[PDB]
Structure formats: structure tokens, C-alpha cells
Amino acid sequence: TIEQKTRAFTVPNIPLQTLSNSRFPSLIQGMILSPDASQVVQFQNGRCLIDGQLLGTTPATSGQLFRVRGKINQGARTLNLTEVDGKPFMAFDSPAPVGFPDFGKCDWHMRISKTPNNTSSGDPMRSVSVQTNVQGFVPHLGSIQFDEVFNHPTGDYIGTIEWISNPSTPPGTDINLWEIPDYGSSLSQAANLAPPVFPPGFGEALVYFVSAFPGPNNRSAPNDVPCLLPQEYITHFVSEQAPTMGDAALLHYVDPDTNRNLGEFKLYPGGYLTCVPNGVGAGPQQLPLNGVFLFVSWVSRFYQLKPVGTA
């Protein structure tokens, strides 16, 4: 319809501290730049074009996000993946089931249970671990491998990653949440992976939203999980499907108390935000978390942003 093709672009009118990470369900705790200025990312969750087109394994909502479901035989180590709702995973069409975790360079410590409940007593929860750099980690081929033999009843199991730690192999490897796992194998590459996102250059830098995920690391610091878009943005774009009318959407990060602009950002149609750091050490990490991004105007990709933060 005319209304559909002329629908004005909008973003959710909710402060950042109230929005959610799109790589796992949790409130956003901060904005950062990548420590390495040359960092290329290829996250498979939290990927959505601003006209509402989902990419990779990205779910429309938080409900499928960061869940794992599959069938496993008693005495086996192989979890044969399905979609979160139990329907078959059509492999070769996607890197993994919708919402499947994209945490690379770490051991996964999972909690799962047999579904649906058919018990009248007892604790249903089971702890399993998954290494992602072993030959058995082939979600694109429809399966992942647990570390130990699964001595529990054959059936349909659902759960999630509860905490993460350094990869078991090779020794001395630290967690790196900037990376995704290898979804395929040596004989078969992962098909329909969401594309990489490169640093924009020319004074601009990618902005990442971070939330702490449980687990230790070599720095004795939180495992901060970076993502490109709040999940609420993704849901909003999927619902609205507003046509993209320019090269980039100019956003102002506005202080709700004073109505003053705290920072200028560009939201690119590919579903990521950039800013211009105001010198070395400056960036969006210096901004308070109670601001609201407001859509100002469609702009050219060449439009220059006022630098953000203080050196």
C-alpha cells in the first residue's frame, strides 16, 4: 500500500539502559569502541537491516535468542539440532538454527532439560559442556558435540549457555567474544553467514553495545559481549519495515533531563552505528546510559559527525 511505501523511519523511544543485548538476553550496560581499531566483526545474531530484513541466525525477538535445542541418544555425545520450537533445522540454508549462540573462542557451559516435562519428581537440569573449535562442532551440518558421554534418557533437550571460560585448546588461549565460532567443517563451509562489518574509517568508528556474561577470564574482569544493535531495535524494524530513504540515519543521543544532544551517531542501513571519537581515549563509553537515541534525519554517507567524548 501507499502507507507501507511511505512509512516514516523511527527508532524505539526507550533509554539505552533499558534496552537489551542482541547476542544474549540481558540489559545493555555500556557502549564501547573495539580495542583494536582494525577489528572486523561478523556476529550472526543481532544482525538486521534497518528496513527489517533479518540476517544470519538473528531472531525477530528475544524469545528464540541464545537457546539451543536438539535430540540426543543416551550414551552418545552428539546433539542433533532442531529449531527452538522443535521443528527440523534445514541445514545448508543457514549457519545454525535461529537464535543459536554465536560466542566464538570460548568453552560453553550449558544447562539443558528434557522437553516437554513428563516427570512428577526430581531435578530435571543437566550440565553439559561444548567446545567450539573441535571437529564435532558442526551446527551448519546439524550437530554439536558434548565433552562427556550423556548418560541421561534419550530425548528432546532444550537449554542455553550458562557461563563461559577460556577455550580448552590450544593452551593459553583467552576468551575472545569479538569472534564467532566455525559453524561448518573443513569439507563444508557455513552457508548464508551474515556478512562481515568493517571499520568505516575516515574518522568514524563502530559502536558496540556491551553486557557482562558470566564466567572468569585472564584479566579477572567481566566477559563483555559486544553487539551491533539493541534487540528492541531489531524487533522494531521487523515490525515497521520502514523503507530506507537515505545512505544513513542521523541519530542524536539525547539527555532526557536537559534535552541536550550528548552525541551524534550514524545508523547505517546494514544495521550498525558509528561515531567520531574526539581524540585518543575518547568515545561513547564516556556517555551516561540513560540517554535516548532520536532519529534526526536521513543523511549522506559522507555527512560528518560532531566528535563524541573527551580525549
Added chain:
Amino acid sequence: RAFTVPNIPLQTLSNSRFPSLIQGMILSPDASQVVQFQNGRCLIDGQLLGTTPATSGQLFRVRGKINQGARTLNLTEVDGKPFMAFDSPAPVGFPDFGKCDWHMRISKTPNNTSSGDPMRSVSVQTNVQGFVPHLGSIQFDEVFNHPTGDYIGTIEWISNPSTPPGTDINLWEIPDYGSSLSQAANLAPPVFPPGFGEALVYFVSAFPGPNNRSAPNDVPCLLPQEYITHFVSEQAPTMGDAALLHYVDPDTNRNLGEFKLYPGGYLTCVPNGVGAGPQQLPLNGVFLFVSWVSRFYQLKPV
């Protein structure tokens, strides 16, 4: 601002009492069922009630401080900000699962170590003297012989309440937020059956744990969480007694049923006798706002 609801299929939307996809749309088994959920409560002009969070990120989490050797978790908000006692039933997003024991998994935050499994299992009874979230604290079943600190987590599975004996899980109920000397302030009010041919619609999702029926633990809620987020963001003024919605098949554009969304944040329909109701409908439909209507607007039976 014109009123709208999200353009997303129901099966893709989330429960507002815990983060999970909606798996069903039902009437209460008891037609006289009164509910008083504290989560999933939002006026349709975007005003949150009870303990309801604006978004899923805050929903169904518990955070607080606990000392090594103690049983008491002194609650904060999910982001770590102080919780004000006597003001509300519990911190925003605090679970509202009544009539069950809670089996939780929690961990000390932020991480400050290079080694070890951080996860701790604790259990909470909600009908005991020590369950006083309105006063800012809850009591674990056992002494917490783990490091002192700031802990965050959630309920992992539920089971029958420990007391009194022979009590089964009833997720239609909420816990007793109050104390021996003080009732909980600012509880979201009860929602009563509408009568006059109409019935409340509930969205259900299964939660882990055993029960006496050896079947799923079904959690009913009044609104999808995404609707709540949408209303909070949009702040569209309520301009009639009820918002008439059509539940539409997106593949064919066929209207599958008429519903009324009331200002208080709940949906009704008219069942076409016994056996009829919204549970007969496919879950891939999208609700669409049609018009503001009066309270006495007669819905076509579903």
C-alpha cells in the same frame, strides 16, 4: 499519536512473566478465575504497573547482596541500583510465580577472577516468613556458604511448594510479597472476568520442572512483552472504551477472529459456546488494530 500493536506473528512474541516464546492462547480453565499478575501489566497508553519492566532484559531476574554464612538476599534493582522498601511489591522484573518452590541459579557479579565455575544453586520458598521482597529481602532454604557479594540470577526450574504438604503448583497465583506486619504497597490490581459473553485471553509458555500431572508447567500472562515495550515507546493515548483487534492470517489476510483490548492491558474475546475459544486458532496470526469501540460493542464469536 495513533494507536497500533506490533506487526509480528503471535508465535514469535514473548511471554511477559518470563522470557520465552508464546506457545498458546487460552481461556482460564475456571471461568471465574481472577488474576493479579505483577509482571506483564501495562496500561495500553504505555504505563507500567506492579513490577512490570519495559523490556525483556529486566524481566524474571533477581539481584541482591548476600553475606557468606547468611540465608538472606538483600535485593537491589536488576542494574544494581538500590531498591526502595515499602514502595512497591518487589524490584522491577522480580518473578511473580506463586504457589511453587523456586530453584535458582545465581553468580557473583561483576567477575573479578581468572578461575572456576561461578554458578551457585539456591532455593527459595515464597510462603515462608522470610519471603519479604516488599521489605527488600528473600530467604534461601540453606545457609549460603559461598563468597560474600553482589549476586544476579534467575529461576531455573520450579516444583511443588514445600509447605503445606500436598500443595500443587498453581501458576495462576502470585507470591505473598508482604510481611507479617505490612501488606505490599502498589500491587497491580486484580483483573476480573468481564462477563456478558466475554472471556479473558491468556498467553501461555511452558516452564521447566515436575508437577503432579507429570505435564508441562504452563505460565499464563495477559500481554506479550513486545506489546508492553511498544506501548511504553509509543505512548499513544487511549481514545475509546476498548481497542478492537482483528487476528489476521498474514499469508492470506483473512480475519480469524475479533478481540477487544481494554485500557487496563488485557484482551477479551467471545467464545462460541463450550469447546470454542482462541485456543482453536493457529498461532501464526498477527493482531491488527481496527478501531476504538465502546464497552458494549458485541464481538463476533471465536
